Design a protein around this nucleic acid. Sequence first.
RNA 1: AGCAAAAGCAGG
Lengths: 51, 121, 121
Amino acid sequence: NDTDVVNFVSMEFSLTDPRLEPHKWEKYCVLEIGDMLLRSAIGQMSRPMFL
Amino acid sequence: QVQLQESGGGMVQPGGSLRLSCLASGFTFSNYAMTWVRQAPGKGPEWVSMVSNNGADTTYTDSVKGRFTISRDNAKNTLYLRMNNVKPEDSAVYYCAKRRYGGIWTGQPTDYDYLGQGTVT
Amino acid sequence: QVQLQESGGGMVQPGGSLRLSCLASGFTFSNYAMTWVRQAPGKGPEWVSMVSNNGADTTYTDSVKGRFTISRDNAKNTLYLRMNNVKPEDSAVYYCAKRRYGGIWTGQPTDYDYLGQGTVT
RNA sequence: AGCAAAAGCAGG
């Protein structure tokens, strides 16, 4: 039937860290995937990358 | 005496091209490697490119690969830089400088001489 | 009275961009379709683009598809054309004109009005 | 585990 649920897993990359707002997700499962070297007007940010 | 006067800059539109020229006089040109180093208003300078004496060993920043092409002509003792696909963040004052040594990798990018001008878009 | 004065042209380098503007006055702008037509020195003009009254139906020449973008603003009663990836052969004198009808496909591209300027690269 | 709800999926 059309009503039925289908389940799956979803991976969407993310810069902003968790633990700033751990209430927003009680459901996520955050990994670390290293750095991405963002370029700001001065220097380089080099923030980590989480998934 | 050693002086570096650059030109060719001006206003352009995003996604365009520009051909920066640098004329050096006063020293032995073919012996020393050359560098382009830019500075955005507010942020300290960042090296743009380093080019060899032979013109065969060239190196660019991690954010400008594929968009830029540095070269030099030893006859008129001059330095050419072709900037294509100008991003809005490349809007800074560009600088032409003459390396301490004749190398490119020996030592971190720092210079010991004067400067000319640079335009902004 | 009806007058078409255009500007925005100039020198550029191959692979750059250009933004041509055309200001028309004296008639009802939103009613009539508009056309950009260029002319190379020596060859009769060739139509570049035809733009609708709604600004939704646009058509370009078979050799400028993907490189150009025509648009219009009804407030100032003006016509804009953004050219990217300037080929060396697109170097011609551009013409801004106001179609006989408010349509694009009804009838072959020919105009009955005045002209401004067009630059060359 | 999840989805989402005053009941169902998470295969038959």
